[PDB]
Design a protein around this ligand. Structure first.
Ligand SMILES: CCCCCCCCCCCCCCCCCC(=O)OC[C@H](COP(=O)(O)OCCN)OC(=O)CCCCCCCCCCCCCCCCC
Ligand SMILES: NC(=O)C1=CN([C@@H]2O[C@H](COP(=O)(O)OP(=O)(O)OC[C@H]3O[C@@H](n4cnc5c(N)ncnc54)[C@H](OP(=O)(O)O)[C@@H]3O)[C@@H](O)[C@H]2O)C=CC1
Ligand SMILES: *P(=O)(O)OCC(C)(C)[C@H](O)C(=O)NCCC(=O)NCCSC(=O)CCCCCCCCCCCCC
Ligand SMILES: [Zn+2]
Lengths: 117, 337, 115, 499, 88, 154
């Protein structure tokens, strides 16, 4: 566990993002890792950090439709209620929605989950 | 023997016993495992689900070892004796380190002193550096720092170096070994071994290599074997003449030898070893051992201290010499004379 | 039709217990007669006494059978195992898989894990 | 999990005394969820939340290796070097009669108690205690007649009950799915309930008659006694908290005297008005085989070797400071942390153990998973140490021990059924004849369940119950209260569950 | 008339049914009160189960135990049958 | 001697460190039972291991009852060897060769007959039956002359 490519869980995020995720430092150790190039190992980006750099899709309708934007390529079409003063998230892809009726409340919170703008 | 092993550093090992898919919980490193003995210790450790690091030099000669264990079990590391890092990288995840590195004859880059003393020095110093639980170093029979045979002297000084650095060393002294691919029975059935200095009358207590790999496995589990010294010899004493008699009775060939006077043969043997690249069986010191005789040094534990009773070489001549019977006598039963 | 092989024996039912009695002796005799011939075919390094010991034990495990229709299945299996062995269809690993070269107490079993 | 990848095991809940029939869903090494399964005689397709949601405590604080206390630290031991260390201590102490003491906990099964009774008996001890307070002295009800300590009108008997008196028990926190059956009968019929003890927030209506024996005496002499007298299928239910009380001696004679006075109502051809409600799975089965302190002479002999057989809620006065403590169990909790040697045993999702519920139904678990680490079966541990101590026990297999079990009480060989108490009226002797002059103190009845979510080692180690208690303390209705998920005050979420 | 010193428990295994004669239940009906009053410190475990051959156990010191069937015995013959067990 | 572990039972090629000690095995002398397990070729471990014979209860999560129709025979989990974690990937290893197998029978008697003939140890549990009770929609609205014990909400 000498390099950062053998400790950081992902290049974009250092810590684990699941209850059960074995830390990289705890899985790059052992005899099987003694003559190994760490940066040559598969080290993919954490999707938990990426999805949360998306900005909120603002809408006035009570109910929004998300199908993943790909048409048949995306995901099954669903509908998200936006009534709670909170950013509503698509359960398949994580895209954030908010209703403009909470624009003043959300732009008052000390922090949030997604970029409001 | 149990489902719980506790090591000298005190870590526990909760084991699931059988098969190559199970959990032996032990991480071993076996230096010198691509030789003759090394496979039997590696197969024993690997087929009971233990992780085995196999430091190797030539890539193609290590390959038979991977079959011993499951996926991820046998880990190959490429090392050199004079590459301390590769030595340290190989023993630092381990709870036992086997040192089986030896050579009968000098080489252009290793003397007997360089491969035995200095090789053990680096291996033991890494065992000390990373605090590995167990260290079973394999010396030879008749090992003595006061010896005059380079083999018996240099392997006798490495014995003292190992203890001086890591006192809990299990020192193991096997007798000349027989088995499949042994340099005992297969040479007496060969045709190259025609030269000889004595009349093949030197005596020793030959030991099955299979029972020595088993003995090394039991020393890992019997923790009380740490810091001890083991001489692992067979049930009978024979000369090279008595062994060669058994071989002839088995292969049905009646091999012959050319005897030379030692002041004549020894200089030549030192030339063949210096002018040929392969193991020729002939060298100045191997002639000197040829005139020496085996002594079982007392105050040394035995097979009985592992609770093992070795078998006689005679019972094994048919199994290992049958490839060398001529077609006319091949279909015959074992000699059992 | 196609020829039955060298030791092929037609599958027939035992007429009575006397029939079965005589067949089982014939099968045991034929096995122990062949033990010297098994040893050199398969390069067995043990002596023939051990091989015949194992033949005896295989027959002894079916000692206490009092059913004609179970004996005849058993006389079938030995006929096929004899034919298979003598024609050298099986190899040394199969014949050595047949020679084995559980804890003896509760406390021994307990201390090592179950067995 | 997905349901097609789940192995389904039909077992018994041991987290209370009802023996609710459950389905244990496992994916290999790990239990995934606990489901109810139909038993109209016992649980009626319902389980409570602790039975349901505490399974995650089966994977968290487990004992997998023998530990010997050395220099104030717990170090790993081989099974041999732990049984030898136990045997050496016993040999050194030379315990005479009843200086060997055994305390059994809530989750112990009958294959362990019958095995432990046979070990202690041959060591010279009859000192066989129980984990509750007052579990180390003779009990107010004895164990000679089974009707002394059972729910004699069945759990199915509440389906007909017309009048029910409660004596010192909160039926919600003791038998939650039995509490529902009372409500069901109450909504659809003219069932009258009164209670003596601490008031509790109830799912049914009841009359609070008082908190102590004086109130109970007026209760039977007053209108509810006449209601109990006049009714068909009357029902007095004594909680195990009474048996824990100072005046269990006096409470149990008062109730039975009312019953015997009022047979042909209470003791008819087909009815038994007398019930004792157990809140632990091990306790009726303990009574079934005599695993109970017989006399105060035994209880007054200070032990020097104490085995805690799954015991963790033991009173600190029942364990000597200088005694050699051996703890056997599956969780590292209050019992394991005061012992000299710990022996890892099995949990109920990994053993086939017999349990007897509060009414005397004999049920068996089925192992959903194998043993973790180096844990053993508990009755094998007890049998193993009987070798080391010098008195090996005859049986070497579960069938041989279940043959032993069936000649302590033959009902233990009849599974899934409840045997009828033949000599029902013999309950007068230990209940009244043996309980006549009692130094009544007047101390009111207690609330023996302070926290429903924490009642045993498994629950106290469950992250899910830890969230149930904490949310109940502050009232946070939020789903992700101490769980993964995004919140307004938690923009980034958390991986922690239970914290 | 209490027991002999040494009996640590009594254990009767009978059945509710008349499949076996009512004599064990008749003896226990009468015996258990007085046979518990004279020596309250000893457990006399009355255990019954359908189709149980009547039988009695006395457990003695250091784990030893004596069994005797009660099958075919009468309420008097059963009385001496227990009597030899707790008299010495 | 009263169901004893026989420690002299011979071992065969299939006995491992997870094979139970057997109380008894078939030898073909037994009355009226075909000794199939003696001639089947299965190891002796099949006669040291108890099976469970039962009708699976309905899952709590569904109302369909088709998996409750028949009798199922499974093999009990042993204390060691049922599952352990592979050091390499974390996959779940096993040494129990009966863990993924089950038999289905039309009647309870068929299951007993098969287990007797195969030499299995076997335990039967009987299915818990539903207690019938008439259900009337009109109970939802019954008149109450006195205090409403609860307020129904439909
Ligand atoms: C072609 C270019 C020259 C070939 C290599 C010459 C360099 C050399 O070192 O030759 C000496 C060589 C040493 O052989 P060596 O392996 O040390 O002896 C042990 C075997 N018994 O001994 C030899 O002569 C090898 C034969 C060539
Ligand atoms: N076999 C016998 O009759 C007896 C053996 N012994 C000792 O037992 C041990 C094992 O015996 P056996 O297996 O038969 O011996 P082998 O000679 O067959 O094996 C020796 C091992 O040492 C390694 N080795 C030798 N020199 C070096 C070096 N300079 N650097 C790195 N590795 C080196 C070899 O690796 P590589 O193959 O890559 O060269 C080989 O794996 C040896 O130490 C031997 O001296 C003692 C008494 C009798
Ligand atoms: P006496 O009156 O005592 O008669 C002895 C016998 C054995 C006949 C019995 O009294 C008897 O009738 N018992 C029932 C029959 C019986 O024992 N078994 C049925 C015969 S078939 C059988 O036993 C087959 C055994 C296994 C196959 C043959 C053995 C050889 C196996 C391979 C050997 C090595 C190959 C590599
Ligand atoms: Zn979407």
């Amino acid at each position: 566990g000498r390099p950062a490519s053998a400790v950081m869980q992902a290049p974009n995020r250092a810590e684990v993002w699941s209850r059960s995720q074995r830390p990289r430092s705890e899985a790059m150790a052992g005899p099987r890792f003694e003559q190994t190039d760490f940066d040559a190992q598969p080290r993919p980006w954490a999707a938990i950090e990426l999805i949360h750099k998306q900005p909120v899709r603002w809408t006035h309708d009570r109910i929004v439709a998300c199908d993943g934007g790909g048409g048949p390529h995306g995901h099954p079409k669903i509908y998200i209620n936006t009534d709670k003063p909170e950013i509503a998230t698509c359960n398949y892809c994580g895209l954030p929605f908010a209703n403009e009726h909470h624009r003043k409340y959300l732009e008052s919170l000390p922090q949030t989950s997604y970029p409001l703008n | 023997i149990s489902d719980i092993h506790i090591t000298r550093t005190g870590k526990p090992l909760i084991r699931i016993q059988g098969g190559r898919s199970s959990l032996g919980e032990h991480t071993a490193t076996v230096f010198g495992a691509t030789g003759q003995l090394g496979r039997y210790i590696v197969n024993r450790l690997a087929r009971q689900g233990c992780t085995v690091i196999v430091p190797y030099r030539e890539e193609m000669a290590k390959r038979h070892l991977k079959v011993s264990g499951d996926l991820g079990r046998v880990i190959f590391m490429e090392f050199d004796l004079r590459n301390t890092q590769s030595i340290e990288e190989s023993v630092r995840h381990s709870d036992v380190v086997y040192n089986l590195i030896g050579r009968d004859y000098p080489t252009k880059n290793f003397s007997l002193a360089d491969v035995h003393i200095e090789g053990t020095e680096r291996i033991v110093e890494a065992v000390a550096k990373y605090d590995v639980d167990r260290f079973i170093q394999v010396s030879t029979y008749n090992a003595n720092p006061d010896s005059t045979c380079e083999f018996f002297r240099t392997k006798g000084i490495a014995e003292k170096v190992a203890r001086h650095v890591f006192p809990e060393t299990t020192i193991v002294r096997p007798a000349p070994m027989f088995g499949f691919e042994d340099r005992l029975l297969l040479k007496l059935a060969s045709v190259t071994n025609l030269f000889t200095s004595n009349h093949m009358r030197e005596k020793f207590w030959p030991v099955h290599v299979n029972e020595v790999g088993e003995a090394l496995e039991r020393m890992l589990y019997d923790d009380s074997t740490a810091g001890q010294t083991f001489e692992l010899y067979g049930p009978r004493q024979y000369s090279m003449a008595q062994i060669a008699e058994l071989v002839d009775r088995e292969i049905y060939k009646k091999r012959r030898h050319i005897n030379l006077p030692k002041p004549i043969l020894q200089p030549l043997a030192e030339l063949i070893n210096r002018v040929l690249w392969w193991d020729t069986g002939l060298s100045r010191d191997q002639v000197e051992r040829e005139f020496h005789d085996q002594v079982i040094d007392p105050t040394a534990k035995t097979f009985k201290d592992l609770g093992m009773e070795p078998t006689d070489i005679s019972k094994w001549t048919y199994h290992y010499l049958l490839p060398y019977r001529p077609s006319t006598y091949y279909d015959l039963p074992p000699s059992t004379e | 039709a196609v020829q039955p092989t060298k030791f092929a024996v037609t599958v027939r039912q035992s007429r009575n217990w006397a029939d079965a009695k005589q067949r089982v002796i014939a099968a045991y005799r034929a096995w122990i007669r062949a033990a010297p011939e098994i040893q050199t075919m398969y390069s067995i390094p043990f002596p023939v006494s051990h091989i015949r010991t194992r033949i005896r034990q295989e027959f002894e495990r079916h000692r206490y059978v009092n059913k004609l229709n179970v004996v005849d299945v058993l006389l079938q299996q030995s006929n096929a195992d004899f034919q298979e062995t003598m024609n050298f269809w099986r190899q040394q690993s199969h014949v050595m898989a047949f020679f084995k070269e559980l804890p003896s107490n509760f406390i021994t079993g307990f201390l090592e894990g179950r067995n | 999990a997905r349901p097609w990848e789940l192995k389904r095991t039909e077992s018994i809940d041991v987290l209370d005394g009802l023996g609710s029939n459950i389905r244990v869903d496992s994916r290999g090494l790990e239990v995934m969820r606990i489901l109810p399964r139909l038993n109209d005689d016992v649980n009626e397709e319902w389980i409570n939340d602790k039975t349901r949601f505490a399974c995650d405590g089966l994977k968290t604080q487990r004992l997998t290796m023998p530990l010997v206390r050395r220099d104030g630290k717990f170090e790993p031991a081989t099974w041999e070097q732990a049984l030898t260390e136990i045997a050496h201590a016993y040999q050194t102490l030379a315990p005479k009669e009843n200086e060997f003491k055994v305390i059994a906990g809530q989750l112990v099964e009958v294959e362990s108690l019958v095995a432990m009774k046979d070990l202690a008996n041959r060591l010279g001890s009859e000192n066989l205690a129980l984990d509750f307070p007052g579990g180390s002295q003779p009990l107010a009800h004895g164990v000679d007649i089974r009707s002394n300590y059972l729910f004699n009108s069945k759990i199915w008997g509440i389906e007909e009950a017309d009048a029910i008196l409660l004596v010192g028990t909160n039926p919600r926190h003791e038998a939650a799915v039995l509490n529902a059956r009372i409500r069901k009968q109450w909504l659809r019929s003219d069932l009258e309930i009164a209670a003596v003890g601490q008031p509790w927030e109830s799912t049914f209506d009841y009359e609070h008659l008082g908190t102590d024996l004086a109130a109970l005496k007026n209760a039977l002499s007053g209108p509810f006694g006449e209601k109990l007298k006049k009714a068909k299928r009357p029902m007095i239910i004594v909680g195990s908290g009474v048996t824990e009380h100072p005046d269990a001696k006096a409470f149990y004679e008062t109730v039975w005297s009312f019953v015997e006075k009022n047979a042909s109502n209470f003791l008819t051809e087909e009815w038994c008005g007398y019930n004792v409600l157990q809140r632990a799975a091990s306790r009726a089965g303990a009574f079934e085989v005599g695993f109970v302190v017989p006399s105060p002479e035994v209880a007054a002999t200070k032990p020097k070797f104490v085995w805690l057989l799954g015991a963790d809620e033991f009173d600190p006065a029942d364990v000597p400071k200088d005694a050699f403590i051996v703890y056997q169990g599956h969780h590292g909790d209050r019992g394991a942390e005061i012992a000299d040697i710990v022996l890892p045993g099995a949990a109920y999702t990994e053993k086939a153990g017999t349990y007897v519920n509060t009414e005397g139904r004999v049920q068996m678990t089925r192992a959903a998973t194998g043993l973790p680490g180096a844990a053993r079966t508990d009755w094998k541990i007890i049998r193993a140490v009987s070798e080391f101590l010098g008195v090996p026990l005859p049986y070497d297999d579960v069938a041989q021990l279940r043959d032993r079990m069936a000649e302590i009480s033959p009902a233990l060989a009849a599974y899934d059924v409840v045997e009828p108490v033949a000599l029902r009226h013999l309950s007068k002797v230990q209940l009244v004849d043996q309980n006549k002059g009692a130094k009544v103190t007047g101390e009111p009845l207690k609330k023996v369940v302070e926290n429903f979510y924490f009642t045993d080692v498994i629950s106290r180690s469950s992250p899910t119950m830890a969230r149930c208690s904490a949310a109940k303390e502050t009232g946070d209705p939020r789903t992700n209260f101490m769980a993964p998920g995004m919140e307004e005050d938690r923009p980034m979420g958390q991986i922690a569950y239970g914290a | 008339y209490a027991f002999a010193k040494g009996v640590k428990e009594l254990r009767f295994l009978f059945c509710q049914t008349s499949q076996h004669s009512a004599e064990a239940r008749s003896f226990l009906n009468r015996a258990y009160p007085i046979m518990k009053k004279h020596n309250p410190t000893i457990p006399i475990l009355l255990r019954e189960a359908q189709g149980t051959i009547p039988r009695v156990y006395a457990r003695y010191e250091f784990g030893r135990e004596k069994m005797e069937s009660l099958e075919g015995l009468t309420d008097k013959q059963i009385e001496e049958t227990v009597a030899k067990l707790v008299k010495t | 001697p009263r169901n004893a572990p026989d420690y002299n039972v011979p071992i065969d090629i299939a006995t491992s460190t997870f094979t139970p000690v057997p109380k008894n095995v078939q030898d073909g002398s037994e009355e009226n039972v075909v000794p199939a397990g003696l001639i089947s070729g299965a190891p002796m471990e099949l006669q040291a291991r108890t099976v469970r014979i039962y009708k699976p209860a309905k899952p709590a999560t569904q109302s369909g009852e088709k998996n409750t129709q028949l009798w199922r025979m499974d093999w009990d989990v042993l204390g060691k060897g049922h599952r352990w974690e592979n050091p390499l990937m974390g996959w779940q290893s096993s040494a129990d060769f009966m863990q993924g197998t089950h038999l289905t029978f039309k009647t309870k008697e068929d299951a007993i007959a098969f287990a007797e003939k195969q030499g299995y140890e076997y335990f039967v549990q009987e299915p818990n039956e539903r207690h019938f009770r008439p259900k009337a929609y009109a109970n939802n609205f019954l008149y109450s002359p006195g205090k409403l014990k609860h307020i129904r909400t439909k």
